[PDB]
Amino acid sequence: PMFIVNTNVPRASVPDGFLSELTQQLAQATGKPPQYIAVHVVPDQLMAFGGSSEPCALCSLHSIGKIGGAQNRSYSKLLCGLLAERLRISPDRVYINYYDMNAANVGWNNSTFA
Amino acid sequence: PMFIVNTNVPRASVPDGFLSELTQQLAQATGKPPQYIAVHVVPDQLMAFGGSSEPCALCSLHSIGKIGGAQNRSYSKLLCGLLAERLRISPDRVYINYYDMNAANVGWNNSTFA
Amino acid sequence: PMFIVNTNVPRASVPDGFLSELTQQLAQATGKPPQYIAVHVVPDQLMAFGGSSEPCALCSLHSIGKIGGAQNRSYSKLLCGLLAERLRISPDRVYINYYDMNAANVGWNNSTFA
Ligand SMILES: COCCOc1ccc2nc(-c3cn(-c4ccc(O)cc4)nn3)ccc2c1
């Protein structure tokens, strides 16, 4: 799986250990080994949410399976909780796009996961 | 909705009011309430379009519905027009990917929109 | 087609000619004229793959058709080979998400490809 967060929060406000924490929490939440979890944080962005430039985050989680109605609700509680706690972004200023990827449409290690 | 534009145009060439104009005009075009519209501009990017590094843009628009043949043509005209007038980017050097997201696959405020 | 690579490799380790090489090789692989190929490289990113900060890349390839099992395997071998040779990224530290875009869902030059 792959989690990306884009945010206007400054680089200095991203805690040491944030990428590791996301990796571990996502490994546990998706039930996949941490070796397959990729995380990407992009601070200092020029963005707005509802016309305001207060802290916000625009995010995506891609996974081959483990994406669905209840699971996505659970990921959203988890990830909004982490963004609130670690980056001080209000949950109602977070968007997360979830993508259930077909294995044939994910490239890795010179091939795909098909 | 979520609108993102990545461009090789320098930050200094992005005018004051650009995120606000995007927010307002997308609210107009999509019908969506402006308080739920998020916008993101990423200048100074290392990119080429057709092998050339003249000004260009790669964009996305994600929305729960309001995506379709006619609506996307309307959005493209609006958005290319905005990038041409505001960023001096030729419309034939812009790509916009449109995504009709299932409400269950959009996280917000500790849950999803389903 | 549009190809995006996000990487923690620093800008100075991206060799001159890289965007043109991606442009030309993707034109050949997809059987599409290079005028249609857009490429975007984003170095210096804060990212981890498997909880490690060793060089890695998170990429996407969007195309209107020419996406599928065998094609995506071929694209992956091509693109991992390029990232390994040029950016010194191990192939098993690369994810490429493939998207088969519907012509109606790609904006360009004030309209869409529909
Ligand atoms: C008085 O208004 C009551 C609330 O009405 C609405 C109507 C449409 C809405 N539409 C949305 C919405 C959010 N998106 C969306 C946002 C981000 C994204 O990555 C993908 C889709 N698309 N639509 C959210 C809240 C809404 C609330």
mmCIF file of C-alpha atoms and ligand atoms in Angstrom:
data_model
loop_
_atom_site.group_PDB
_atom_site.id
_atom_site.type_symbol
_atom_site.label_atom_id
_atom_site.label_comp_id
_atom_site.label_asym_id
_atom_site.label_seq_id
_atom_site.Cartn_x
_atom_site.Cartn_y
_atom_site.Cartn_z
ATOM 1 C CA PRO A 1 0.000 0.000 0.000
ATOM 2 C CA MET A 2 0.917 3.610 -0.524
ATOM 3 C CA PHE A 3 -0.075 6.609 1.575
ATOM 4 C CA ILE A 4 0.562 10.160 0.421
ATOM 5 C CA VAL A 5 -0.196 13.315 2.388
ATOM 6 C CA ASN A 6 0.108 16.767 0.872
ATOM 7 C CA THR A 7 -0.185 19.647 3.331
ATOM 8 C CA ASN A 8 0.423 23.341 3.893
ATOM 9 C CA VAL A 9 1.867 22.544 7.339
ATOM 10 C CA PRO A 10 5.565 23.515 7.397
ATOM 11 C CA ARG A 11 8.415 20.943 7.167
ATOM 12 C CA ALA A 12 9.569 21.855 10.745
ATOM 13 C CA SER A 13 6.188 20.771 12.148
ATOM 14 C CA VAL A 14 6.481 17.208 10.762
ATOM 15 C CA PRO A 15 7.717 15.178 13.775
ATOM 16 C CA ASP A 16 10.816 13.007 13.606
ATOM 17 C CA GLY A 17 9.396 9.440 13.441
ATOM 18 C CA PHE A 18 6.287 10.451 11.492
ATOM 19 C CA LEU A 19 7.075 8.324 8.386
ATOM 20 C CA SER A 20 7.911 5.318 10.605
ATOM 21 C CA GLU A 21 4.697 5.771 12.567
ATOM 22 C CA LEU A 22 2.606 5.936 9.444
ATOM 23 C CA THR A 23 4.415 2.815 8.138
ATOM 24 C CA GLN A 24 3.709 0.788 11.276
ATOM 25 C CA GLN A 25 0.097 1.940 11.742
ATOM 26 C CA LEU A 26 -0.658 1.287 8.077
ATOM 27 C CA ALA A 27 0.987 -2.159 8.150
ATOM 28 C CA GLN A 28 -1.322 -3.015 11.086
ATOM 29 C CA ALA A 29 -4.447 -1.386 9.622
ATOM 30 C CA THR A 30 -4.180 -3.037 6.146
ATOM 31 C CA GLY A 31 -2.868 -6.331 7.557
ATOM 32 C CA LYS A 32 0.121 -6.301 5.187
ATOM 33 C CA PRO A 33 3.764 -6.638 5.997
ATOM 34 C CA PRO A 34 5.517 -3.304 6.573
ATOM 35 C CA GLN A 35 7.989 -4.119 3.771
ATOM 36 C CA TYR A 36 5.167 -3.337 1.291
ATOM 37 C CA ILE A 37 4.068 -0.056 2.890
ATOM 38 C CA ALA A 38 5.206 3.179 1.263
ATOM 39 C CA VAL A 39 4.611 6.605 2.804
ATOM 40 C CA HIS A 40 5.125 10.084 1.374
ATOM 41 C CA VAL A 41 4.686 13.420 3.181
ATOM 42 C CA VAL A 42 4.750 16.712 1.224
ATOM 43 C CA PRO A 43 4.763 19.771 3.482
ATOM 44 C CA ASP A 44 4.859 23.498 2.732
ATOM 45 C CA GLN A 45 2.261 23.280 -0.021
ATOM 46 C CA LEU A 46 0.226 26.095 -1.505
ATOM 47 C CA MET A 47 -3.287 24.819 -0.899
ATOM 48 C CA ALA A 48 -6.694 25.742 0.375
ATOM 49 C CA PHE A 49 -9.696 23.874 1.761
ATOM 50 C CA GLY A 50 -13.096 25.603 1.536
ATOM 51 C CA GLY A 51 -11.331 28.830 0.544
ATOM 52 C CA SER A 52 -9.189 28.892 3.737
ATOM 53 C CA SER A 53 -5.433 28.354 3.970
ATOM 54 C CA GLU A 54 -5.546 27.185 7.613
ATOM 55 C CA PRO A 55 -3.889 23.768 8.037
ATOM 56 C CA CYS A 56 -5.327 21.132 5.738
ATOM 57 C CA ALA A 57 -4.253 17.910 4.082
ATOM 58 C CA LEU A 58 -4.989 16.269 0.770
ATOM 59 C CA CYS A 59 -4.213 12.583 0.814
ATOM 60 C CA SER A 60 -4.401 9.263 -0.940
ATOM 61 C CA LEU A 61 -4.214 5.604 0.091
ATOM 62 C CA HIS A 62 -3.693 3.039 -2.676
ATOM 63 C CA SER A 63 -3.977 -0.668 -1.848
ATOM 64 C CA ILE A 64 -4.485 -3.921 -3.776
ATOM 65 C CA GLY A 65 -7.634 -4.935 -1.902
ATOM 66 C CA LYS A 66 -8.355 -4.042 1.738
ATOM 67 C CA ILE A 67 -10.372 -1.076 0.424
ATOM 68 C CA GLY A 68 -14.100 -0.855 1.090
ATOM 69 C CA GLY A 69 -16.963 0.865 2.935
ATOM 70 C CA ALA A 70 -16.200 -0.102 6.554
ATOM 71 C CA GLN A 71 -12.420 -0.398 6.093
ATOM 72 C CA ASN A 72 -12.188 3.074 4.599
ATOM 73 C CA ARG A 73 -14.150 4.512 7.527
ATOM 74 C CA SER A 74 -11.603 2.862 9.843
ATOM 75 C CA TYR A 75 -8.597 4.132 7.824
ATOM 76 C CA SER A 76 -10.089 7.635 7.914
ATOM 77 C CA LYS A 77 -10.457 7.593 11.741
ATOM 78 C CA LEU A 78 -6.897 6.310 12.063
ATOM 79 C CA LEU A 79 -5.277 8.714 9.569
ATOM 80 C CA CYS A 80 -7.240 11.827 10.562
ATOM 81 C CA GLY A 81 -6.301 10.977 14.167
ATOM 82 C CA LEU A 82 -2.644 10.877 13.266
ATOM 83 C CA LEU A 83 -2.806 14.097 11.235
ATOM 84 C CA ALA A 84 -4.589 15.876 14.127
ATOM 85 C CA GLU A 85 -2.181 14.578 16.754
ATOM 86 C CA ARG A 86 1.095 14.878 14.874
ATOM 87 C CA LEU A 87 0.461 17.796 12.447
ATOM 88 C CA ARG A 88 -2.369 19.683 14.215
ATOM 89 C CA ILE A 89 -4.687 19.440 11.230
ATOM 90 C CA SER A 90 -8.334 19.381 11.981
ATOM 91 C CA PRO A 91 -10.068 16.196 10.705
ATOM 92 C CA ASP A 92 -12.697 18.254 8.880
ATOM 93 C CA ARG A 93 -9.894 19.831 6.782
ATOM 94 C CA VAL A 94 -8.625 16.413 5.567
ATOM 95 C CA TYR A 95 -9.494 14.662 2.322
ATOM 96 C CA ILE A 96 -8.353 11.074 1.571
ATOM 97 C CA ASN A 97 -8.900 9.437 -1.827
ATOM 98 C CA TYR A 98 -8.989 5.645 -1.543
ATOM 99 C CA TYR A 99 -8.030 3.496 -4.523
ATOM 100 C CA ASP A 100 -8.552 -0.253 -4.735
ATOM 101 C CA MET A 101 -5.823 -1.126 -7.250
ATOM 102 C CA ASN A 102 -5.910 -4.178 -9.505
ATOM 103 C CA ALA A 103 -2.744 -6.192 -9.079
ATOM 104 C CA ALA A 104 -2.101 -6.062 -12.846
ATOM 105 C CA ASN A 105 -2.094 -2.246 -12.607
ATOM 106 C CA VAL A 106 0.657 -2.009 -10.005
ATOM 107 C CA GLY A 107 4.241 -2.118 -11.174
ATOM 108 C CA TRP A 108 6.969 -3.319 -8.806
ATOM 109 C CA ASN A 109 10.359 -5.044 -9.147
ATOM 110 C CA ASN A 110 10.463 -4.982 -12.993
ATOM 111 C CA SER A 111 6.995 -6.529 -13.294
ATOM 112 C CA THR A 112 3.533 -6.135 -11.719
ATOM 113 C CA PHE A 113 1.776 -7.833 -8.824
ATOM 114 C CA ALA A 114 -0.460 -9.901 -11.196
ATOM 115 C CA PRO B 1 -13.993 18.180 -4.734
ATOM 116 C CA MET B 2 -10.197 18.272 -5.030
ATOM 117 C CA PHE B 3 -8.365 20.184 -7.789
ATOM 118 C CA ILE B 4 -4.562 19.964 -8.126
ATOM 119 C CA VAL B 5 -2.285 21.672 -10.649
ATOM 120 C CA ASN B 6 1.367 20.831 -11.079
ATOM 121 C CA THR B 7 3.326 23.196 -13.303
ATOM 122 C CA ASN B 8 6.805 24.276 -14.293
ATOM 123 C CA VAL B 9 5.720 27.911 -14.032
ATOM 124 C CA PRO B 10 7.662 29.701 -11.211
ATOM 125 C CA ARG B 11 5.975 30.446 -7.910
ATOM 126 C CA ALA B 12 6.375 34.188 -8.459
ATOM 127 C CA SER B 13 4.203 33.900 -11.608
ATOM 128 C CA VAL B 14 1.246 32.579 -9.619
ATOM 129 C CA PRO B 15 -0.845 35.685 -8.951
ATOM 130 C CA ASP B 16 -2.500 36.726 -5.722
ATOM 131 C CA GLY B 17 -6.026 35.411 -5.510
ATOM 132 C CA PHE B 18 -5.413 32.327 -7.679
ATOM 133 C CA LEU B 19 -6.488 29.694 -5.151
ATOM 134 C CA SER B 20 -9.561 31.742 -4.312
ATOM 135 C CA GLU B 21 -10.464 32.103 -7.985
ATOM 136 C CA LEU B 22 -10.060 28.399 -8.515
ATOM 137 C CA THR B 23 -12.256 27.666 -5.479
ATOM 138 C CA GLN B 24 -15.009 30.051 -6.602
ATOM 139 C CA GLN B 25 -15.041 29.003 -10.261
ATOM 140 C CA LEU B 26 -14.999 25.292 -9.503
ATOM 141 C CA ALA B 27 -17.963 25.866 -7.138
ATOM 142 C CA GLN B 28 -19.727 27.605 -10.057
ATOM 143 C CA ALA B 29 -18.867 24.894 -12.569
ATOM 144 C CA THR B 30 -19.450 21.735 -10.470
ATOM 145 C CA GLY B 31 -22.384 23.017 -8.408
ATOM 146 C CA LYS B 32 -20.578 21.861 -5.280
ATOM 147 C CA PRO B 33 -20.596 23.922 -2.097
ATOM 148 C CA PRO B 34 -17.434 26.030 -1.933
ATOM 149 C CA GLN B 35 -16.676 25.039 1.642
ATOM 150 C CA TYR B 36 -15.998 21.435 0.416
ATOM 151 C CA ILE B 37 -13.710 22.443 -2.497
ATOM 152 C CA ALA B 38 -9.988 21.988 -2.004
ATOM 153 C CA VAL B 39 -7.392 23.381 -4.349
ATOM 154 C CA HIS B 40 -3.643 22.822 -4.607
ATOM 155 C CA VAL B 41 -1.075 24.534 -6.850
ATOM 156 C CA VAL B 42 2.435 23.139 -7.219
ATOM 157 C CA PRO B 43 4.748 25.496 -9.111
ATOM 158 C CA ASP B 44 8.440 25.231 -10.057
ATOM 159 C CA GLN B 45 8.115 21.596 -11.179
ATOM 160 C CA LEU B 46 10.526 19.660 -13.306
ATOM 161 C CA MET B 47 8.340 18.569 -16.178
ATOM 162 C CA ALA B 48 8.075 18.381 -19.936
ATOM 163 C CA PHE B 49 5.098 18.045 -22.298
ATOM 164 C CA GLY B 50 5.780 16.645 -25.745
ATOM 165 C CA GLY B 51 9.521 16.756 -24.982
ATOM 166 C CA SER B 52 9.530 20.523 -24.394
ATOM 167 C CA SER B 53 9.866 22.485 -21.131
ATOM 168 C CA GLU B 54 7.822 25.460 -22.226
ATOM 169 C CA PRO B 55 5.107 26.249 -19.659
ATOM 170 C CA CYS B 56 2.780 23.310 -19.133
ATOM 171 C CA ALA B 57 0.421 21.824 -16.515
ATOM 172 C CA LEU B 58 -0.644 18.386 -15.268
ATOM 173 C CA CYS B 59 -3.841 18.578 -13.281
ATOM 174 C CA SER B 60 -6.483 16.469 -11.610
ATOM 175 C CA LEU B 61 -10.069 16.953 -10.558
ATOM 176 C CA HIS B 62 -11.623 14.472 -8.165
ATOM 177 C CA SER B 63 -15.324 14.736 -7.318
ATOM 178 C CA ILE B 64 -18.144 12.546 -5.984
ATOM 179 C CA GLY B 65 -20.269 12.770 -9.137
ATOM 180 C CA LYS B 66 -20.524 15.822 -11.403
ATOM 181 C CA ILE B 67 -18.082 14.044 -13.746
ATOM 182 C CA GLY B 68 -19.171 13.162 -17.269
ATOM 183 C CA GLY B 69 -18.754 13.865 -20.974
ATOM 184 C CA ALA B 70 -20.294 17.316 -21.163
ATOM 185 C CA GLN B 71 -19.310 18.449 -17.635
ATOM 186 C CA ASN B 72 -15.649 17.533 -18.193
ATOM 187 C CA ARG B 73 -15.539 19.474 -21.479
ATOM 188 C CA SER B 74 -17.022 22.489 -19.548
ATOM 189 C CA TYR B 75 -14.378 22.037 -16.741
ATOM 190 C CA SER B 76 -11.584 21.809 -19.311
ATOM 191 C CA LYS B 77 -12.563 25.036 -21.013
ATOM 192 C CA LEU B 78 -12.863 26.817 -17.657
ATOM 193 C CA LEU B 79 -9.617 25.487 -16.274
ATOM 194 C CA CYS B 80 -7.521 25.824 -19.404
ATOM 195 C CA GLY B 81 -8.847 29.377 -19.673
ATOM 196 C CA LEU B 82 -7.764 30.080 -16.104
ATOM 197 C CA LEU B 83 -4.300 28.581 -16.607
ATOM 198 C CA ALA B 84 -3.872 30.536 -19.861
ATOM 199 C CA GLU B 85 -4.963 33.901 -18.413
ATOM 200 C CA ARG B 86 -3.328 33.542 -14.962
ATOM 201 C CA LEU B 87 -0.245 31.370 -15.593
ATOM 202 C CA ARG B 88 0.364 32.019 -19.344
ATOM 203 C CA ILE B 89 0.123 28.305 -20.054
ATOM 204 C CA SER B 90 -1.101 27.278 -23.518
ATOM 205 C CA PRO B 91 -4.225 25.123 -23.356
ATOM 206 C CA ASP B 92 -2.659 22.483 -25.649
ATOM 207 C CA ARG B 93 0.093 21.983 -22.990
ATOM 208 C CA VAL B 94 -2.387 21.067 -20.244
ATOM 209 C CA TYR B 95 -3.650 17.662 -19.232
ATOM 210 C CA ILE B 96 -6.446 17.270 -16.707
ATOM 211 C CA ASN B 97 -7.355 13.855 -15.374
ATOM 212 C CA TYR B 98 -10.957 13.604 -14.100
ATOM 213 C CA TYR B 99 -11.964 11.093 -11.387
ATOM 214 C CA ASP B 100 -15.537 10.228 -10.406
ATOM 215 C CA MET B 101 -14.994 9.014 -6.873
ATOM 216 C CA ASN B 102 -17.403 6.714 -5.040
ATOM 217 C CA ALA B 103 -18.490 8.441 -1.801
ATOM 218 C CA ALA B 104 -17.218 5.360 0.138
ATOM 219 C CA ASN B 105 -13.731 5.997 -1.266
ATOM 220 C CA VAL B 106 -13.479 9.618 -0.016
ATOM 221 C CA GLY B 107 -12.316 10.073 3.587
ATOM 222 C CA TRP B 108 -13.116 13.263 5.489
ATOM 223 C CA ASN B 109 -13.629 14.174 9.182
ATOM 224 C CA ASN B 110 -12.753 10.713 10.616
ATOM 225 C CA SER B 111 -15.149 8.906 8.298
ATOM 226 C CA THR B 112 -16.130 8.867 4.606
ATOM 227 C CA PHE B 113 -18.919 10.389 2.563
ATOM 228 C CA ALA B 114 -20.913 7.131 2.124
ATOM 229 C CA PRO C 1 0.253 9.628 -21.731
ATOM 230 C CA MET C 2 1.513 11.086 -18.486
ATOM 231 C CA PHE C 3 4.294 9.652 -16.287
ATOM 232 C CA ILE C 4 5.085 11.024 -12.795
ATOM 233 C CA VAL C 5 7.997 9.895 -10.583
ATOM 234 C CA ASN C 6 8.244 11.039 -6.961
ATOM 235 C CA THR C 7 11.495 10.125 -5.247
ATOM 236 C CA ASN C 8 13.687 10.843 -2.246
ATOM 237 C CA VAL C 9 16.708 10.926 -4.542
ATOM 238 C CA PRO C 10 18.123 14.490 -4.463
ATOM 239 C CA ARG C 11 17.772 16.834 -7.449
ATOM 240 C CA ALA C 12 21.508 16.816 -8.093
ATOM 241 C CA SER C 13 21.434 13.050 -8.609
ATOM 242 C CA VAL C 14 18.892 13.367 -11.455
ATOM 243 C CA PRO C 15 21.060 13.343 -14.586
ATOM 244 C CA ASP C 16 20.754 15.813 -17.416
ATOM 245 C CA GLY C 17 18.607 14.331 -20.163
ATOM 246 C CA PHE C 18 16.314 12.388 -17.857
ATOM 247 C CA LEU C 19 13.005 13.973 -18.858
ATOM 248 C CA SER C 20 13.799 13.638 -22.576
ATOM 249 C CA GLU C 21 14.801 10.005 -22.083
ATOM 250 C CA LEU C 22 11.523 9.253 -20.310
ATOM 251 C CA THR C 23 9.652 11.097 -23.056
ATOM 252 C CA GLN C 24 11.327 9.133 -25.863
ATOM 253 C CA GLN C 25 11.249 5.713 -24.222
ATOM 254 C CA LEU C 26 7.555 6.081 -23.210
ATOM 255 C CA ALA C 27 6.656 7.204 -26.735
ATOM 256 C CA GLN C 28 8.283 4.028 -28.068
ATOM 257 C CA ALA C 29 6.752 1.749 -25.400
ATOM 258 C CA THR C 30 3.196 3.039 -25.762
ATOM 259 C CA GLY C 31 3.375 3.353 -29.574
ATOM 260 C CA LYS C 32 2.271 6.986 -29.298
ATOM 261 C CA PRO C 33 3.916 10.088 -30.783
ATOM 262 C CA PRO C 34 6.189 11.860 -28.330
ATOM 263 C CA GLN C 35 4.158 15.079 -28.737
ATOM 264 C CA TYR C 36 1.547 13.334 -26.570
ATOM 265 C CA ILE C 37 3.891 12.288 -23.746
ATOM 266 C CA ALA C 38 4.120 14.377 -20.556
ATOM 267 C CA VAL C 39 6.714 13.590 -17.880
ATOM 268 C CA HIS C 40 7.185 14.926 -14.344
ATOM 269 C CA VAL C 41 10.042 14.191 -11.871
ATOM 270 C CA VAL C 42 9.824 15.288 -8.231
ATOM 271 C CA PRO C 43 13.086 14.728 -6.337
ATOM 272 C CA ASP C 44 14.031 15.469 -2.766
ATOM 273 C CA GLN C 45 10.824 13.982 -1.323
ATOM 274 C CA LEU C 46 10.215 12.930 2.270
ATOM 275 C CA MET C 47 9.240 9.318 1.755
ATOM 276 C CA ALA C 48 9.911 5.802 2.972
ATOM 277 C CA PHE C 49 9.408 2.412 1.373
ATOM 278 C CA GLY C 50 9.179 -0.526 3.799
ATOM 279 C CA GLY C 51 10.011 1.918 6.598
ATOM 280 C CA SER C 52 13.425 2.574 4.997
ATOM 281 C CA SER C 53 14.732 5.898 3.638
ATOM 282 C CA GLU C 54 16.943 4.177 1.034
ATOM 283 C CA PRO C 55 16.290 5.490 -2.492
ATOM 284 C CA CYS C 56 12.770 4.666 -3.611
ATOM 285 C CA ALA C 57 10.133 5.943 -6.049
ATOM 286 C CA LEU C 58 6.358 6.203 -6.213
ATOM 287 C CA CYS C 59 5.169 6.706 -9.775
ATOM 288 C CA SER C 60 2.122 6.726 -11.981
ATOM 289 C CA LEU C 61 1.510 6.151 -15.648
ATOM 290 C CA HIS C 62 -1.826 7.359 -17.105
ATOM 291 C CA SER C 63 -2.763 6.495 -20.717
ATOM 292 C CA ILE C 64 -5.936 6.362 -22.795
ATOM 293 C CA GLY C 65 -5.686 2.648 -23.511
ATOM 294 C CA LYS C 66 -2.443 0.699 -23.994
ATOM 295 C CA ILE C 67 -2.793 -0.408 -20.339
ATOM 296 C CA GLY C 68 -3.160 -4.049 -19.348
ATOM 297 C CA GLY C 69 -1.463 -7.103 -17.927
ATOM 298 C CA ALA C 70 1.368 -7.786 -20.373
ATOM 299 C CA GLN C 71 1.799 -4.164 -21.388
ATOM 300 C CA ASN C 72 2.121 -3.063 -17.751
ATOM 301 C CA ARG C 73 4.730 -5.773 -17.155
ATOM 302 C CA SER C 74 6.692 -4.405 -20.084
ATOM 303 C CA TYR C 75 6.321 -0.794 -18.897
ATOM 304 C CA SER C 76 7.492 -1.820 -15.444
ATOM 305 C CA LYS C 77 10.647 -3.521 -16.726
ATOM 306 C CA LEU C 78 11.380 -0.421 -18.852
ATOM 307 C CA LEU C 79 10.737 2.117 -16.092
ATOM 308 C CA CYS C 80 12.391 0.196 -13.214
ATOM 309 C CA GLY C 81 15.416 -0.282 -15.504
ATOM 310 C CA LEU C 82 15.567 3.491 -16.095
ATOM 311 C CA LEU C 83 15.148 4.365 -12.398
ATOM 312 C CA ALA C 84 17.878 1.841 -11.466
ATOM 313 C CA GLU C 85 20.386 2.958 -14.124
ATOM 314 C CA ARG C 86 19.726 6.721 -13.824
ATOM 315 C CA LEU C 87 18.664 7.302 -10.210
ATOM 316 C CA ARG C 88 20.218 4.218 -8.534
ATOM 317 C CA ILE C 89 16.853 3.067 -7.196
ATOM 318 C CA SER C 90 16.439 -0.636 -6.664
ATOM 319 C CA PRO C 91 13.461 -2.033 -8.688
ATOM 320 C CA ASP C 92 11.926 -3.568 -5.604
ATOM 321 C CA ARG C 93 11.733 -0.072 -4.043
ATOM 322 C CA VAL C 94 9.526 1.267 -6.891
ATOM 323 C CA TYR C 95 5.715 1.328 -7.176
ATOM 324 C CA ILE C 96 4.122 2.404 -10.437
ATOM 325 C CA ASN C 97 0.370 2.819 -10.481
ATOM 326 C CA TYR C 98 -1.139 2.308 -13.947
ATOM 327 C CA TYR C 99 -4.361 4.060 -14.998
ATOM 328 C CA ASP C 100 -6.351 3.278 -18.097
ATOM 329 C CA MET C 101 -8.092 6.591 -18.627
ATOM 330 C CA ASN C 102 -11.371 6.962 -20.489
ATOM 331 C CA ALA C 103 -11.069 9.606 -23.243
ATOM 332 C CA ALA C 104 -14.011 11.556 -21.688
ATOM 333 C CA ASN C 105 -12.031 11.810 -18.454
ATOM 334 C CA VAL C 106 -8.960 13.499 -19.941
ATOM 335 C CA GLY C 107 -8.990 17.242 -20.477
ATOM 336 C CA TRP C 108 -6.678 18.949 -22.972
ATOM 337 C CA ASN C 109 -6.796 22.111 -25.129
ATOM 338 C CA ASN C 110 -10.132 23.466 -23.743
ATOM 339 C CA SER C 111 -12.039 20.188 -24.165
ATOM 340 C CA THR C 112 -11.521 16.445 -23.682
ATOM 341 C CA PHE C 113 -10.417 13.589 -25.905
ATOM 342 C CA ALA C 114 -13.974 12.147 -26.112
HETATM 343 C C1 LIG D 1 -26.090 22.647 2.877
HETATM 344 O O1 LIG D 1 -25.261 21.664 2.256
HETATM 345 C C2 LIG D 1 -25.407 20.366 2.826
HETATM 346 C C3 LIG D 1 -24.181 19.564 2.436
HETATM 347 O O2 LIG D 1 -24.194 19.389 1.016
HETATM 348 C C4 LIG D 1 -23.123 18.859 0.336
HETATM 349 C C5 LIG D 1 -23.237 18.712 -1.048
HETATM 350 C C6 LIG D 1 -22.200 18.170 -1.794
HETATM 351 C C7 LIG D 1 -21.039 17.777 -1.146
HETATM 352 N N1 LIG D 1 -20.034 17.249 -1.882
HETATM 353 C C8 LIG D 1 -18.901 16.858 -1.282
HETATM 354 C C9 LIG D 1 -17.777 16.308 -2.068
HETATM 355 C C10 LIG D 1 -16.473 16.017 -1.734
HETATM 356 N N2 LIG D 1 -15.908 15.563 -2.887
HETATM 357 C C11 LIG D 1 -14.559 15.129 -2.979
HETATM 358 C C12 LIG D 1 -13.587 15.758 -2.201
HETATM 359 C C13 LIG D 1 -12.272 15.324 -2.269
HETATM 360 C C14 LIG D 1 -11.938 14.302 -3.131
HETATM 361 O O3 LIG D 1 -10.657 13.907 -3.179
HETATM 362 C C15 LIG D 1 -12.887 13.677 -3.904
HETATM 363 C C16 LIG D 1 -14.207 14.097 -3.848
HETATM 364 N N3 LIG D 1 -16.812 15.553 -3.903
HETATM 365 N N4 LIG D 1 -17.952 16.015 -3.392
HETATM 366 C C17 LIG D 1 -18.737 16.994 0.094
HETATM 367 C C18 LIG D 1 -19.753 17.536 0.865
HETATM 368 C C19 LIG D 1 -20.918 17.931 0.242
HETATM 369 C C20 LIG D 1 -21.957 18.466 0.994
#
